[PDB]
Design an enzyme around this catalytic site. Sequence first.
Site, PDB file in Angstrom:
ATOM      1  N   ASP B  45      50.818  19.642 -34.641  1.00 55.39           N
ATOM      2  CA  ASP B  45      51.859  20.355 -33.912  1.00 55.39           C
ATOM      3  C   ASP B  45      52.237  21.655 -34.604  1.00 55.39           C
ATOM      4  O   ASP B  45      52.647  22.611 -33.935  1.00 55.39           O
ATOM      5  CB  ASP B  45      53.087  19.466 -33.732  1.00 55.39           C
ATOM      6  N   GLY B  46      52.117  21.712 -35.932  1.00 48.00           N
ATOM      7  CA  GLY B  46      52.306  22.978 -36.621  1.00 48.00           C
ATOM      8  C   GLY B  46      51.320  24.029 -36.156  1.00 48.00           C
ATOM      9  O   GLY B  46      51.694  25.176 -35.897  1.00 48.00           O
ATOM     10  N   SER B 156      61.255  19.205 -24.996  1.00 51.63           N
ATOM     11  CA  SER B 156      60.113  18.735 -25.777  1.00 51.63           C
ATOM     12  C   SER B 156      60.419  18.712 -27.271  1.00 51.63           C
ATOM     13  O   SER B 156      59.827  17.912 -28.002  1.00 51.63           O
ATOM     14  CB  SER B 156      58.868  19.583 -25.485  1.00 51.63           C
TER      15      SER B 156
HETATM   16  C1  LIG Z   1      59.066  20.643 -41.363  1.00 55.28           C
HETATM   17  C2  LIG Z   1      57.970  21.038 -41.525  1.00 55.28           C
HETATM   18  C3  LIG Z   1      56.610  21.515 -41.781  1.00 55.28           C
HETATM   19  C4  LIG Z   1      55.660  21.303 -40.604  1.00 55.28           C
HETATM   20  C5  LIG Z   1      55.975  22.185 -39.408  1.00 55.28           C
HETATM   21  N1  LIG Z   1      56.572  21.474 -38.270  1.00 55.28           N
HETATM   22  C6  LIG Z   1      55.564  21.206 -37.247  1.00 55.28           C
HETATM   23  C7  LIG Z   1      55.928  20.188 -36.246  1.00 55.28           C
HETATM   24  C8  LIG Z   1      56.202  19.317 -35.475  1.00 55.28           C
HETATM   25  C9  LIG Z   1      56.567  18.385 -34.448  1.00 55.28           C
HETATM   26  N2  LIG Z   1      57.033  18.736 -33.266  1.00 55.28           N
HETATM   27  C10 LIG Z   1      57.290  17.526 -32.630  1.00 55.28           C
HETATM   28  C11 LIG Z   1      57.802  17.226 -31.353  1.00 55.28           C
HETATM   29  N3  LIG Z   1      58.111  18.150 -30.437  1.00 55.28           N
HETATM   30  N4  LIG Z   1      57.960  15.923 -31.031  1.00 55.28           N
HETATM   31  C12 LIG Z   1      57.619  14.992 -31.926  1.00 55.28           C
HETATM   32  N5  LIG Z   1      57.116  15.155 -33.152  1.00 55.28           N
HETATM   33  C13 LIG Z   1      56.973  16.452 -33.446  1.00 55.28           C
HETATM   34  N6  LIG Z   1      56.489  16.999 -34.616  1.00 55.28           N
HETATM   35  C14 LIG Z   1      55.970  16.236 -35.741  1.00 55.28           C
HETATM   36  O1  LIG Z   1      56.957  16.181 -36.754  1.00 55.28           O
HETATM   37  C15 LIG Z   1      56.359  16.476 -38.032  1.00 55.28           C
HETATM   38  C16 LIG Z   1      56.823  17.872 -38.404  1.00 55.28           C
HETATM   39  N7  LIG Z   1      56.552  18.194 -39.795  1.00 55.28           N
HETATM   40  C17 LIG Z   1      57.025  17.472 -40.806  1.00 55.28           C
HETATM   41  O2  LIG Z   1      57.793  16.527 -40.652  1.00 55.28           O
HETATM   42  C18 LIG Z   1      56.547  17.874 -42.176  1.00 55.28           C
HETATM   43  C19 LIG Z   1      55.876  16.729 -42.912  1.00 55.28           C
HETATM   44  C20 LIG Z   1      56.548  16.451 -44.237  1.00 55.28           C
HETATM   45  N8  LIG Z   1      55.598  15.884 -45.169  1.00 55.28           N
HETATM   46  C21 LIG Z   1      54.861  16.277 -37.829  1.00 55.28           C
HETATM   47  O3  LIG Z   1      54.516  14.904 -37.992  1.00 55.28           O
HETATM   48  C22 LIG Z   1      54.671  16.737 -36.384  1.00 55.28           C
HETATM   49  O4  LIG Z   1      53.548  16.119 -35.764  1.00 55.28           O
HETATM   50  C23 LIG Z   1      57.784  22.165 -37.812  1.00 55.28           C
HETATM   51  C24 LIG Z   1      58.792  21.235 -37.168  1.00 55.28           C
HETATM   52  O5  LIG Z   1      59.226  20.243 -38.115  1.00 55.28           O
HETATM   53  C25 LIG Z   1      60.394  19.657 -37.573  1.00 55.28           C
HETATM   54  N9  LIG Z   1      61.233  19.168 -38.661  1.00 55.28           N
HETATM   55  C26 LIG Z   1      61.723  19.872 -39.729  1.00 55.28           C
HETATM   56  N10 LIG Z   1      62.514  19.178 -40.511  1.00 55.28           N
HETATM   57  C27 LIG Z   1      62.546  17.926 -39.916  1.00 55.28           C
HETATM   58  C28 LIG Z   1      63.225  16.735 -40.242  1.00 55.28           C
HETATM   59  N11 LIG Z   1      64.047  16.606 -41.289  1.00 55.28           N
HETATM   60  N12 LIG Z   1      63.042  15.668 -39.434  1.00 55.28           N
HETATM   61  C29 LIG Z   1      62.237  15.792 -38.375  1.00 55.28           C
HETATM   62  N13 LIG Z   1      61.552  16.862 -37.966  1.00 55.28           N
HETATM   63  C30 LIG Z   1      61.754  17.902 -38.780  1.00 55.28           C
HETATM   64  C31 LIG Z   1      61.071  20.719 -36.687  1.00 55.28           C
HETATM   65  O6  LIG Z   1      61.216  20.208 -35.367  1.00 55.28           O
HETATM   66  C32 LIG Z   1      60.090  21.901 -36.736  1.00 55.28           C
HETATM   67  O7  LIG Z   1      59.958  22.531 -35.465  1.00 55.28           O
END
Ligand SMILES: C#CCCCN(CC#Cc1nc2c(N)ncnc2n1[C@@H]1O[C@H](CNC(=O)CCCN)[C@@H](O)[C@H]1O)C[C@H]1O[C@@H](n2cnc3c(N)ncnc32)[C@H](O)[C@@H]1O
Lengths: 262, 262, 262, 262
Positions: B45-46, B156
């Site tokens: 997703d990133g 989303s």
């Molecule tokens: C962070 C970071 C680095 C990575 C970049 N990511 C990409 C993405 C995504 C995304 N969009 C969705 C969605 N639409 N549906 C469901 N799932 C989704 N994801 C999934 O969530 C994770 C995101 N990254 C991490 O958790 C980093 C890993 C740590 N070792 C991955 O598994 C994605 O597969 C950006 C997105 O981060 C989300 N993010 C940030 N901080 C948190 C947190 N504390 N808890 C939950 N999500 C968080 C936020 O919204 C941002 O846009």
Amino acid sequence: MKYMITSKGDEKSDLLRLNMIAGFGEYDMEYDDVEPEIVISIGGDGTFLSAFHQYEERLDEIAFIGIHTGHLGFYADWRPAEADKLVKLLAKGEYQKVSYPLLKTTVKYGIKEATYLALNESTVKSSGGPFVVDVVINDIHFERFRGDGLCMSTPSGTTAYNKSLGGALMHPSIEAMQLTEMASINNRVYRTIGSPLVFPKHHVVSLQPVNDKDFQISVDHLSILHRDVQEIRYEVSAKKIHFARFRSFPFWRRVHDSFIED
Amino acid sequence: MKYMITSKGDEKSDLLRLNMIAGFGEYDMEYDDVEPEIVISIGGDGTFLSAFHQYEERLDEIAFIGIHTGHLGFYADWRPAEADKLVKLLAKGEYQKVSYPLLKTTVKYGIKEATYLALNESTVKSSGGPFVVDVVINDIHFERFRGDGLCMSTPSGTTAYNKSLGGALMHPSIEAMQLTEMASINNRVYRTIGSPLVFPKHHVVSLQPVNDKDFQISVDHLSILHRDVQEIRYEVSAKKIHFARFRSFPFWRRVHDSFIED
Amino acid sequence: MKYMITSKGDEKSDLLRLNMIAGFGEYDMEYDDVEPEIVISIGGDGTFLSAFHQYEERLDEIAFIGIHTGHLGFYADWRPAEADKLVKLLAKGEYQKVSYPLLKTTVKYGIKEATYLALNESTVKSSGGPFVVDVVINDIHFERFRGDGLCMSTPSGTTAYNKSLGGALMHPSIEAMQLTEMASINNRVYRTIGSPLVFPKHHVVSLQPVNDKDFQISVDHLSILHRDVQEIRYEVSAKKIHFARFRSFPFWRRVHDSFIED
Amino acid sequence: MKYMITSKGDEKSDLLRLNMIAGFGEYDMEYDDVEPEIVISIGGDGTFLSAFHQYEERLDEIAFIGIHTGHLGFYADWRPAEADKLVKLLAKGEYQKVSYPLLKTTVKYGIKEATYLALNESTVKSSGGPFVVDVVINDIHFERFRGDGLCMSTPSGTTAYNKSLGGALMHPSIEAMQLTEMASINNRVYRTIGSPLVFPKHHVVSLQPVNDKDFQISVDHLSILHRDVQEIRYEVSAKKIHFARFRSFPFWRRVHDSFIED
Ligand SMILES: C#CCCCN(CC#Cc1nc2c(N)ncnc2n1[C@@H]1O[C@H](CNC(=O)CCCN)[C@@H](O)[C@H]1O)C[C@H]1O[C@@H](n2cnc3c(N)ncnc32)[C@H](O)[C@@H]1O
Ligand SMILES: C#CCCCN(CC#Cc1nc2c(N)ncnc2n1[C@@H]1O[C@H](CNC(=O)CCCN)[C@@H](O)[C@H]1O)C[C@H]1O[C@@H](n2cnc3c(N)ncnc32)[C@H](O)[C@@H]1O
Ligand SMILES: C#CCCCN(CC#Cc1nc2c(N)ncnc2n1[C@@H]1O[C@H](CNC(=O)CCCN)[C@@H](O)[C@H]1O)C[C@H]1O[C@@H](n2cnc3c(N)ncnc32)[C@H](O)[C@@H]1O
Ligand SMILES: C#CCCCN(CC#Cc1nc2c(N)ncnc2n1[C@@H]1O[C@H](CNC(=O)CCCN)[C@@H](O)[C@H]1O)C[C@H]1O[C@@H](n2cnc3c(N)ncnc32)[C@H](O)[C@@H]1O
């Protein structure tokens, strides 16, 4: 036109009702509690909910108005001090009507069907033992829920039971329903989504028994024991509740006044 | 027609990209990363978020497709084993396009403006010290928020950061945005609503500084320090992201596969 | 010495019980379910809870052991494949005894008293209508609780109902009880603390009726309707449950195996 | 004996400090801010925290007293109107000393060690990118945490940041620390316990980096960027903060006054 007034039944609300009837007697307004066009509720939200369910067969011919004699009831727009202003503005009509979405609950049995309309929410719990249902969304099996129960809320209901369960508050212009969990069990073997779920119009959420088939189902204030249940179906109703508005009282200001400060 | 492919950049995704380009070379498909009509994202997703922001100026001329080479990325519809099937179906076109809502963030300064589009969410935190903003909804002061920060999510995006903050999951057919709190302070003197708030199209949520005027604002993966901020404005965008769908993969099944079991 | 074995009652547990009795017959072990010193529970945590309450009058003379024939029951230390090893180690004794705290619930009536001991928790809900109690801590009025109910948990109970209500997980070496809310109502006029509360030994938490005096009180699996209630008192019991341990199985590893992975 | 007074530094607190010094000049009290035995803090909890850290090397020789010139600071026992009564009672001594537990944080680096004492809490977040740590409890790997960060609170700290993160409120007679999550990610592939964890004395909670080794670590108000971190260790301190009490002000009444009503 035709109107009626329900009262909470304490001295304050009964006397306010009599005074409004007296004031209405000075205009072309007929008291009619069989086929009213305006339904005035004097009391709290419990009183307003009873007025809604008293006339849920004529929701398309009725505009509701609430007067709160206790605190600010959420469906109330007027304090008792403004009743005379309300009588006058109502009598001359030309007001605005706004509509909130409603929730339809269908209960199916073995060897039959019953439908219910909710202004706030419909909840399901077990008849005593453990509560286990399969949650089916548009015919796909979404989860097996184990816990205390489930709550499906309308938008205007999101500030009520839904809020206490951690649900989101939704503006009532959104035609949707929201499903919240009551104390779900989550461990290695049992898994639920946890988060509240918000569904649009035309999505159907079906609860299907796993073992026990007896459930306690509530619709707003009314709670009934249902036996031999095969399915409980939730969907946004095609019917809507209509309010008579005479001035701006935005939903978010209503939320602010009820939960932040007033 | 014109297409391009972004890669996560590991060996697996790079080779898959080269193979798809080779397969596309057998059809009337032109590789063009300046004005593509199909944008394929191979990664997580990133990676998909970077592809979205790479072309956020041509969102009305582009349909996106995601291939997840790691786990099931939420915006991904295909596993790498189906890339050849995807090449074939894409080449012959005649597919379905579905659209998800987006979030517009406007940042105003003293003695200027910047706007950003979010597919997942936009968050605000302070530059180190305490975070205090006044929350203004459609020009009425709703609350003074004290805490770690605030998160405004698209539909989303509700399965992403929003979910971790206790927000509700919303079906993307609902044109809305959802505001969730990060560690709000609530005592005798400080009070927030607590619950997530869901706003429809055309509602404007404005954050206004109380003391400190420096904020760290994130839009999807991108986080910038903004100085001398007078206001942050959130509203559902008029722009939408379009996906190329070739088969049914319902949102709620997508949620089930990502959080319950797959 | 003297021992007894309770069974869940399915074929698997009944046969395991018979085999262990047969194995015990080769040692200086007497089957005695009136005054046992070892109580073996073969089943799940429900089975173990029934064994605890079967002998709650001789808790100081008994060491408990659980065998889980389903999944990992939280009070279970052994899989059925190790029953022969358990028979052998138990017969030769010289084991370690560990003790977990318990919760005392006192129910007072008008124109009488009943006390109950809980290994997991004791909860209070209303007999149907609204639940309102005044919460009194060491004789100071702390809050008026409105909502679904309240849950008071032991340390080992914190992983059970308490966890589903958002309570903290507490190591059982801490002599304490934890009070969690079930769907509290919080608005302009109604206010609860919200957070779980952790109380030490000798603190007394008293629930006092405001209007309705009928309550449904649960103690572990057992739920009774109590009428004409004047007070419900919670305090950490002076009594403790004793477990026979034969190897290290730390509480936090037990939590990890049950909720993270195994 | 020897005493000193810290002030928030506004006119109100500075003048109150001067008046108390003047009153103390009528007794056998010596002003000494190098080796005081009584430390008076005039301000809020931020002021009190700075006084604690100003003398954290002489915690066994000092009894603290707080005067709140703003609202009821949680560590404050006196309003400014009672300062003269406080001067008089302090001068004649013979008071009661009560002690609250403290939290020890140890930070280890590659190619060194630093220890910190917390009255409220110690938190860990990443230096910008994603925060991932392995959580190790008494040398067993408990979970891999992904999210915003983690908070470890003392008992008296449970009403502070810990409360905003959903943690339980613990009476300070319990020698314990409580670990709460900041926005944990939980899906099919990532899993945390979710619930707050309460640890007794002598349990050690160790955070170990997975990839990035730079962390922002806060101890009460003080936040430092730590680079090249190998481990962060939490345990209940052997040191305690001592308060001079002159009258009953129970912790639960303190909680009630701060969060329910006063
Ligand atoms: C962070 C970071 C680095 C990575 C970049 N990511 C990409 C993405 C995504 C995304 N969009 C969705 C969605 N639409 N549906 C469901 N799932 C989704 N994801 C999934 O969530 C994770 C995101 N990254 C991490 O958790 C980093 C890993 C740590 N070792 C991955 O598994 C994605 O597969 C950006 C997105 O981060 C989300 N993010 C940030 N901080 C948190 C947190 N504390 N808890 C939950 N999500 C968080 C936020 O919204 C941002 O846009
Ligand atoms: C219960 C009960 C007896 C009274 C009947 N009421 C009437 C109502 C209402 C209502 N609709 C809304 C709304 N739209 N927006 C915002 N606020 C709203 N309310 C307000 O919530 C309270 C409801 N009653 C009580 O709490 C009982 C008092 C106990 N001493 C009142 O203050 C109402 O002014 C029925 C409604 O109860 C709600 N309810 C039930 N259990 C809980 C719970 N645990 N937490 C929160 N609400 C709960 C549920 O949704 C039901 O429909
Ligand atoms: C209910 C019921 C019928 C079964 C009787 N059980 C036995 C037990 C237990 C127990 N003690 C602990 C513990 N110490 N640590 C960790 N885990 C524990 N458990 C485990 O939790 C489950 C309890 N039963 C069910 O959930 C019923 C299944 C529905 N199809 C099982 O998996 C047990 O292996 C009584 C206990 O129920 C708990 N309970 C009740 N309602 C809920 C709820 N909403 N959420 C979570 N737990 C709940 C409560 O505390 C009670 O004592
Ligand atoms: C921040 C900041 C700047 C001020 C320095 N403060 C001093 C304190 C305190 C303290 N200890 C306790 C306690 N023992 N019991 C109950 N209450 C307590 N407080 C009270 O909480 C507030 C702390 N400050 C703010 O909220 C800043 C205001 C924003 N306009 C004040 O009202 C204090 O009267 C440091 C403490 O901050 C706490 N803190 C930080 N971030 C949050 C957050 N998101 N939510 C809740 N608390 C938070 C944390 O634990 C730290 O130690």
